[PDB]
Write a protein that binds this ligand. Structure first.
Ligand SMILES: [Zn+2]
Ligand SMILES: [Zn+2]
Lengths: 326, 117, 662, 209, 91, 62, 199, 100
DNA sequence: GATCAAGCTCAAGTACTTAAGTCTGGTCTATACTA
DNA sequence: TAGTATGAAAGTACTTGAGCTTGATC
């Protein structure tokens, strides 16, 4: 054995046997301009990355049978509903009496600095005109959005669409990224090392973000995010987004980090020899039977490692010849 | 709003499922087995509390004051009877991050008044 | 059961009583002579005694022409005897008499002798039975899983494990199912309730939810109801269940029969085996679901798999009983086939030639000799490691081996959870004595004052409760379960009560006076959860503790005075326990107990820490085992060192036994 | 909704210009470092209305070594490109006697269209790219070293110097992001120059597969 | 036509089991529980199991719930392939 | 009980197994020591091919 | 003083006078603050013990030369052993909201959660001894479990790179004659003669 | 490959392979006489099915679903695969690492 | 303009392997058949 | 008789059914 990071043998393991589902995958997001110095814009970027579903900002949902929106069942929602129904905005004839009243919270809403407007646009985009949505102003003591279906039964479909929107509907952020942690790095390995006009090295203390997920293709393609230093520990994403030489270097950096965390040191020529052997064939040659017995090393060299009988079976059925080189 | 309780039929006592009367445009509760129907009185069929705004004062019970493993204090007396001694414990309930809150209960029998500071 | 076989004439072969003599040995001439343990260790014999059983065979052919025949003291087989036990020849002997037999008076015994090899049965840990445990697996289709390994009081079949799980969120909500025994497919809980005769959803919920004023639980059970509503009668419910099993009968008649017998014999055998399936099982299954709902809503904490209260120690008693039961069945089988091939020819048979006494003898001998716990043919399905060769390198090793425990998790497992020193090992197991190899934490050692319960029948307790103001489970109405407190006995829900305070005070007063309730009985009164669980089963590890009054101990000076003259006035530990001064507390009862390390903690301090103590430790050093108690100043060394010493004390030379020249 | 679309289009065009410049195509310096304001003034900021439309973003560049060796870059309007659009661009290329082209799709590409990208390979060497992977130039990353496509003469000299065959050099998948960026196919050798803490500079050579 | 079901019998006692079951059929054919099976085949070179000619596994079970020689096969029975009637009686 | 006299072991052209003509296992059988895979790996690192050959072929089962 | 500060932190959290830190839960914040107080006390007492050692002290003579031990060992033998950790966290509530039946329910204090305030010389109390046994057992379990995973890793690494060698043309090649590095370690130098330097 | 070692007495014990080959030669001879003279076809397939099970279990006993080739003392005869599958086998136990 | 079919893509299963090194000591190992 | 014979593993790679594009038809 800020955030929890896997180190030691489990991390060394996941590196040698390239795993598609690591235990603690994370990104290292670096900012470009003013956002790297101030915390307000950095928070804006954090909210622009951290995945936000309707459940994170919803306080409580409730399904009612409102036969006529003019005289609603609820007493506190009668003021803005007539202010919206006095004029024909949608097809009132294609309306259903089953109402889905959602109540949000000012706290989680103001932290992510969202607006009901954006939620309404996300709903009208994800479900089109088939699901009409309305909402009050940002002045009432309670945030509520009233939903209806346009035309399984309606009530059951609503309770099904209630959860559809409550989970998959991404209000803001990038999916697969659960949480993001912002902090100032005290260590110089994460600071911004620049060269002053006098020619001296200066380590600037700038804000950086650490995510709990891994989506490089989408995070790198964002404003105020540095497309040069932003990296990750998931070598699969590095190989899929940047390539084989990049994963070669990223793998060496991860191995060096695992070995140096305890203050130890290993010669770079060894880490390089390992990283090169795992990348000399264009693909991530995992240190396992699934990566070592799939190359042309000869049937005897493979049988000695693993799948001793099966390898010899394939070699016999194919008439393979071991050149006696290893 | 509050959660919504289940209504049982009078014939087979089974539960009814939300249904609507298209002619009069009114909410009805009918049994899916027999031909019984009932006029709803709440108009609400489903309520989901994402915030989990549960008042733990209803889940605690006065008999907990008989626990010798619980700590006792004389600094927070009871407001219903004036008893000095009272037991205090934490929430210990999942889905509640602010679990460090203390819940007090009066050790006096025939009272056991509960509260929070 | 009496084996009724017929070609016509029929015979039942019913047994009534047994008689076990002292250990004996028969030479070639056949002269019966008593065999002493030393003679067995020298001649490589087996220190076993013969088992004599009375048999009664009645002939029934036709016309009520019956006649009964009794075979008194029929030699059915030999049973190995534990040294120094009641039937051992070395019972009650003085140190001088033991010396005349060339035996060491200091030898604690507790081991067998098979072919001259001293074999010791290692106590095997196992998950407790008849108890509902709600767990939650991180990687599984179910969010919460409530299981209950059920087995009847008199175990007769393996533990029929039933699971009541809840489906993970992502049709509409979370569904509750039930993985019944002899069925390879999940079954909704409502179908099981309907199969028991409860078709009305209200009666089903009334057995599940005891307070209808809690709409949160009702909305959580609603998906299971809406999932299984086409079925509204018991016949179909049973037919559906029979269809889900691996033996789907082409005709719905035998399907219903298969489900009826499964729900009557395999599902919850400790909760019933007949009509009981609805009189109590529905109620129990309701509580089983109720625990799952309380767990999913966070109203209750999940159970920890590594808790001694939730575990049991399988000693020589419950182990050898499992063997004797399985072999007795094989004996009755062989006797069936033998007599069957005789009655088919239309003639009588002599049971003396039918009883293959070699079955019980060679079976127990093989099991205790090799360790494979099971039949000689199933040398791979059986679990080894039991019945190890007693270590005779030093007296500390011998004592440690006889007080050794073992967890069947498998040494291959790399999970640190089960190997960790749990908080519940206090006073019951030595925190230092454990191997440092590939079995760290799995192989443990009992503490000095640790006593594993032997077992007792719950009948007298049930008679007292029925005589008390307690109300039975079938006589009450479900509406009364809301405010009432539940009462369990060995995991069987018996009934409910209203004033549990005076109930506990009475049961405790009875246990402290050696009344109907014996000292090994555990009575745990969960206060937040209104359950009251009483236990009389075996394998419950417990230890003694000094009872404490308002603020003082009950162990007065008059007791120490009588204990000093223990050789004169014959006042021993039994008289101390009977005086209500000491109490045997188990790990499950310790949760509800507030201990005091020393009497100094009971005095008035500037700041009162507890001020409401209820028990006290005799001496804190008793938490140590045998190989750890020999360490001087163990509280001044690094814990690993104390562990390594506990492992070396068994390898140290000395005088392992006084009679080493023989 | 709109300012982000024009921002994406500008970033994609800049990356495409850098890509073509890296492949050896004649690209003017002005368009290589074009500010967002210059792009809005030359093309517009109203893609929702249609000004600029993705059809206007079409680029046509010529190689520094061969002026007739041109290359196309198309930006289809449909998120999921179908075979008909490829037939349109292929015919467009036939009309304009061009052999090499790039399709920058928005959401993705149909299977039949990918196969159409493989069967017309000897006649039209046309590639596909996702706008999501074009919003950033991977070669500016710190993990991605400097790649250089070697010529058949340089490869012959390399193989003759170290006295080895092509199958002995390390390999790189043709579908690799850098291999797609430089537009290299099977048989080509790419020279990688990376910094080394043991020697300062290390030059390796990878064969495409 | 009735189908053949394979029922396991004690090794070397198939002939005895067949004789016993036909005797029991003789004794109980006029009773309220007659045997609905049609015949039984015990090939001379087939040891370990025999064939019962019946339309239903229920009929087979009710026929073989006699002597204990067929207890092992009482739990379940196995159909004989349709093409296999011709091979059943070959010598 | 772990004395050195019960642990001291040596072997030089002793008995061999039947299936494979390699040394026995254990002091009780005058067995040889096991030149395991980890040892082979170590001598591979030393580049000692003759020693690795003598141990795996000439000193075990020629 | 450390125990008094922890009592104050507990009173703040019990009265809701403690706010969570950014990126951490209230419980996590409380435990971090408590762990910080205890760690500061252990360091302060350890420094005080180190300052009290004389030049003739043999423990100091062992730590200075580095032959065996460290300052931490001295701090545990003289001043205070410290907090016992299980899975990187304090002693968990094995019982129902309790670490042992000798403590009250919901007692997040130092002595209840495993703060061994005594030194190995002064002797551990019964509870501190049991908790220390927990802290030791986790080390034995790790030492007994990591051997299989690490040995399997050592085997996998060897079998994957057992034929890779430096050929006579100074390049590094495998058994298939393929090239992995044009020069060993990108510089063609052996790792024995090299050493650290400064540019 | 299948040495028949003598025990403490004159009694001779055969290897697992010998015990399996005996079963194979038994079922093979049965099949040969059952085909030389007219025999029930299902019977032939039966012995064949069994022959397939014997030949397979001689080279590979760890077949999922099928019963293990238990022979004397009701224990599965070691299959040629088990002799060289992994640890304590031929390659890793007698070729890569061996006694010296 | 629309359709059904072919067949390519995706998430659900099943089949199969692997699980540190070496060393010592100790016990124990089938009997049914049926003539 | 005398002897033959009968409940605390996890990972990858590959096959299968469901949904959907382009075609050939209409
Ligand atoms: Zn009804
Ligand atoms: Zn009060």
């Amino acid at each position: 054995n800020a955030k929890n990071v896997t180190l030691g043998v489990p991390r060394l393991k996941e590196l040698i046997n390239i795993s598609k589902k690591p235990k603690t995958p994370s990104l290292t997001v670096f900012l470009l301009g003013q956002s790297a110095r101030d915390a307000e814009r950095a928070k804006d970027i954090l909210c622009r990355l951290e995945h936000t579903t309707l459940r994170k900002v919803t306080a409580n949902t409730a399904i009612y049978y409102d036969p006529n929106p003019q005289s609603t069942v609820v007493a506190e929602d009668q003021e803005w509903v007539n202010v919206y129904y006095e004029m024909p905005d949608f097809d009132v004839a294609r309306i259903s009496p089953w109402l889905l009243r959602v109540e949000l919270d000012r706290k989680h809403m103001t932290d992510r600095k969202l607006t009901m407007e954006q939620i309404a646009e996300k709903i009208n985009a994800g479900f089109g005109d088939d699901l009409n949505c309305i909402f009050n102003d940002d002045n009432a003591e309670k945030l509520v959005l009233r939903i209806r279906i346009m035309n399984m039964d309606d009530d059951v479909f609503l309770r099904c669409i209630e959860s559809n929107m409550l989970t998959d509907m991404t209000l803001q952020g990038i999916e697969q990224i659960s949480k993001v942690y912002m902090h100032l790095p005290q260590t110089d390995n994460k600071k911004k090392i620049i060269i002053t006009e006098d020619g001296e090295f200066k380590a600037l203390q700038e804000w950086i973000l650490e995510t709990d997920g891994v989506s490089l293709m989408r995070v790198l393609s964002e404003k105020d995010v540095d497309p040069v230093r932003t990296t990750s520990n998931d070598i699969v994403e590095i190989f899929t987004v940047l390539g084989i030489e990049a994963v070669r270097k990223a793998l060496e950096r991860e191995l060096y980090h695992v070995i140096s965390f305890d203050g130890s040191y290993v010669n770079y020529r060894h880490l390089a020899l390992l990283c090169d052997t795992m990348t000399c064939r264009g693909h991530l040659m995992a240190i396992t039977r699934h990566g070592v017995n799939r190359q042309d090393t000869g049937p005897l060299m493979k049988c000695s490692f693993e799948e001793t009988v099966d390898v010899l079976m394939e070699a016999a059925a194919h008439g393979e010849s071991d050149p006696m080189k290893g | 709003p509050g959660f919504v309780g289940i209504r049982f039929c009078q014939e087979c006592n089974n539960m009814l499922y939300p249904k609507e009367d298209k002619e009069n445009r009114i909410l009805l509760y009918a049994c899916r087995n027999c031909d019984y129907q009932q006029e709803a009185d709440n108009s609400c069929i489903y309520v989901n509390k994402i915030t989990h705004e549960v008042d733990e004062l209803t889940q605690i019970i006065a008999d907990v004051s008989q626990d010798p493993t619980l700590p006792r204090t004389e600094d927070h007396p009871c407001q219903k009877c004036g008893h000095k001694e009272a037991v205090f414990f934490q929430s210990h309930s999942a889905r509640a991050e602010d679990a460090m809150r203390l819940y007090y209960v009066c050790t006096a029998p025939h009272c056991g008044h509960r509260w929070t500071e | 059961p009496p084996i009724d076989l017929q070609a016509p004439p029929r015979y039942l072969l019913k047994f009534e009583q047994i008689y076990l003599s002292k250990p004996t040995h028969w030479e070639r001439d056949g002269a019966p002579s008593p065999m002493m343990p030393n003679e067995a260790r020298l001649r490589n014999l087996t220190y076993s005694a013969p088992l004599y059983v009375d048999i009664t065979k009645t002939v029934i052919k036709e016309g009520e022409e019956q006649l009964q025949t009794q075979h008194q003291k029929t030699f059915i087989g030999k049973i190995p005897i534990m040294l120094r036990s009641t039937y051992c020849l070395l019972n009650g002997l003085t140190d001088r008499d033991l010396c005349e037999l060339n035996e060491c008076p200091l030898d604690p015994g507790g081991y067998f002798i098979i072919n001259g090899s001293e074999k010791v049965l290692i106590a095997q840990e196992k998950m407790a039975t008849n108890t509902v445990y709600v767990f939650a697996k991180k990687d599984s289709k179910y969010a919460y899983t409530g299981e209950c390994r059920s087995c009847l009081e008199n175990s007769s079949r393996p533990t029929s494990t039933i699971w009541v799980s809840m489906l993970a969120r992502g049709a509409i909500g979370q569904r509750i199912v039930a993985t019944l025994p002899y069925i390879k497919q999940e079954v909704p809980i409502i179908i099981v309730f309907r199969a028991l005769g409860f078709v009305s959803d209200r009666d089903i919920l009334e057995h599940i939810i005891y307070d209808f004023e809690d709409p949160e639980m009702m909305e959580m059970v609603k998906p299971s109801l809406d999932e299984a509503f086409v079925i509204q009668e018991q016949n179909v419910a049973l037919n559906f269940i029979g269809s889900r099993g691996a033996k789907p009968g082409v005709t719905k008649e035998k399907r219903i029969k298969y489900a009826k017998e499964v729900l009557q014999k395999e599902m919850l055998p400790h909760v019933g085996v007949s009509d009981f399936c609805e009189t109590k099982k529905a109620y129990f299954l309701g509580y089983m679901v109720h625990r799952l709902l309380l767990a999913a809503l966070g109203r209750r904490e999940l159970d920890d798999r590594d808790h001694y209260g939730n575990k049991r120690l399988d000693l020589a008693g419950p182990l050898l009983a499992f063997l004797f039961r399985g072999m007795f069945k094989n004996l009755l089988k062989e006797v069936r086939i033998y007599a069957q091939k005789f009655i088919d020819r239309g003639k009588d048979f002599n049971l003396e030639l039918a009883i293959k006494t070699r079955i019980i003898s060679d079976g127990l001998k093989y099991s205790l000799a090799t360790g494979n716990w099971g039949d000689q043919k199933k040398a791979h399905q059986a679990r080894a490691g039991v019945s190890q060769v007693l270590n005779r390198l030093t007296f500390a090793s011998t004592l440690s081996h006889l007080r050794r425990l073992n967890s069947p998790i498998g040494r291959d497992g790399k999970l640190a959870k089960p190997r960790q020193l749990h908080n519940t090992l206090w006073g019951m197991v030595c925190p230092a004595e454990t191997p440092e190899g590939h079995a760290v934490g799995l192989v443990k050692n009992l503490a000095l004052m640790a006593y594993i319960s032997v077992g007792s029948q719950p009948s007298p307790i049930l008679e007292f409760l029925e005589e008390w103001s307690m109300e039975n489970l079938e006589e009450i109405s479900p509406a009364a379960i809301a405010d009432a407190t539940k009462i369990f006995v060995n995991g069987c829900w018996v009934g409910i009560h209203k004033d549990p305070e005076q109930l506990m005070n009475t049961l405790r007063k009875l246990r402290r006076q050696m009344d109907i309730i014996v000292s090994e009985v555990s009575m745990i009164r969960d206060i937040r959860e209104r359950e009251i669980r009483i236990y009389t089963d075996a394998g419950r590890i417990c230890r003694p503790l000094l009872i404490v009054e308002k603020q003082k101990l009950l162990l007065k000076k008059r007791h120490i005075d009588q204990l000093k003259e223990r050789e004169y006035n014959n006042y021993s530990w039994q008289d101390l326990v009977a005086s209500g001064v000491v109490e045997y507390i188990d790990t499950l009862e310790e949760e509800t107990v507030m201990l005091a390390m020393t009497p100094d903690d009971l005095q008035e301090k500037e700041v009162a820490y507890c001020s409401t103590y209820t028990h006290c430790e005799i001496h804190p050093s008793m938490i140590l085992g045998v190989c750890a108690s020999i360490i001087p100043f163990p509280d001044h060394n690094q814990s690993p060192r104390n562990t390594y010493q506990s492992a070396m004390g068994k390898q140290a030379m000395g005088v392992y036994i006084t009679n080493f020249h023989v | 909704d709109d300012e982000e679309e024009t921002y994406r289009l500008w970033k994609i065009r800049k990356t495409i210009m850098q890509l073509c410049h890296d492949r050896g195509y004649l690209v003017t310096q002005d368009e290589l470092d074009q500010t967002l304001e210059e792009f809005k003034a030359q093309f517009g900021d109203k893609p929702s209305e249609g000004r600029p439309r993705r059809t206007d973003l079409t680029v046509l560049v010529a190689h520094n070594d061969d002026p007739t060796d041109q290359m196309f870059v198309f930006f289809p309007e449909e998120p999921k490109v179908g075979i008909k659009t490829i037939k349109v661009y292929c015919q467009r290329m036939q009309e304009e006697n061009i052999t090499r082209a790039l399709i920058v799709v928005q959401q993705g590409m149909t299977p039949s269209a990918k196969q159409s990208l493989v069967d017309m390979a000897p006649k039209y060497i046309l590639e596909q790219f996702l706008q999501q992977e074009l919003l950033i130039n991977i070669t500016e990353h710190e993990l991605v070293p400097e790649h250089v496509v070697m010529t058949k003469e340089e490869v012959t000299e390399l193989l003759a110097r170290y006295k080895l065959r092509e199958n002995q050099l390390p390999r790189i998948q043709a579908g690799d992001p850098v291999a797609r960026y430089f537009g290299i196919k099977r048989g080509q050798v790419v020279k990688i120059i990376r910094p080394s803490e043991t020697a300062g500079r290390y030059i390796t050579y990878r064969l495409v597969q | 036509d009735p189908n053949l079901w394979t029922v396991k019998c004690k090794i070397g006692e198939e002939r005895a089991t067949a004789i016993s079951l036909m005797r029991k059929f003789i004794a109980y054919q006029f009773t309220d529980t007659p045997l609905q099976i049609k015949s039984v085949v015990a090939p001379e070179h087939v040891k370990g199991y025999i064939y019962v000619e019946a339309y239903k596994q229920t009929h087979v079970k009710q026929a073989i719930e006699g002597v204990g020689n067929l207890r092992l096969g009482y739990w379940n029975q196995q159909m004989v392939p349709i093409k296999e009637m011709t091979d059943v009686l070959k010598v | 009980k772990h004395m050195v006299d019960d642990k001291i072991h040596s072997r030089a052209r002793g008995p061999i197994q039947i299936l494979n003509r390699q040394p026995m296992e254990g002091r009780s059988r005058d067995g040889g020591l096991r030149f395991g895979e980890m040892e082979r790996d170590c001598q591979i690192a030393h580049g000692a091919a003759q020693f690795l050959r003598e141990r795996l072929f000439e000193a075990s089962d020629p | 003083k450390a125990k008094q500060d922890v009592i104050e932190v507990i009173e703040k959290a019990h009265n809701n006078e403690l706010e969570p830190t950014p990126g951490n839960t209230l419980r996590q914040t409380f435990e971090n603050q408590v762990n910080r107080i205890l760690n500061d006390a252990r360091d302060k007492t350890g420094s005080s013990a180190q300052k009290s050692l004389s030049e003739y002290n043999n423990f100091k003579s062992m730590v200075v030369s580095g032959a065996k031990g460290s300052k931490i060992n001295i701090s545990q033998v003289i001043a205070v052993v410290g907090q016992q950790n299980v899975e990187g966290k304090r002693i968990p509530f094995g019982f129902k909201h309790r670490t042992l039946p000798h403590f009250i329910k919901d007692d997040y204090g130092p002595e209840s959660r495993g703060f061994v305030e005594n030194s190995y010389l002064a002797g551990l109390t019964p509870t501190e001894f049991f908790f220390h046994a927990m802290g030791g057992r986790e080390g034995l379990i790790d030492t007994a479990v990591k051997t299989a995973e690490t040995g399997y890793i050592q085997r996998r690494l060897i079998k994957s790179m057992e034929s890779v060698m430096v050929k006579y043309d100074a390049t590094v090649r495998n058994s298939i004659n393929q090239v992995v590095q044009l020069r060993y370690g990108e510089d063609g130098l052996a790792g024995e003669s090299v050493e650290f330097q400064n540019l | 490959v299948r040495p028949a070692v003598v025990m403490q007495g004159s009694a001779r014990n055969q290897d697992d392979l010998t015990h399996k080959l005996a079963d194979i030669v038994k079922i093979n001879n049965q099949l040969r006489r059952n085909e030389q003279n007219g025999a029930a076809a299902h019977v032939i397939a039966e012995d064949v099915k069994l022959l397939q099970f014997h030949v397979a279990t001689m080279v590979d006993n760890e077949l999922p679903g099928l019963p293990r080739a238990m022979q004397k003392s009701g224990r599965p005869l070691k299959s040629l695969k088990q002799r060289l599958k992994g640890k304590e086998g031929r390659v890793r136990g007698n070729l890569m690492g061996k006694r010296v």
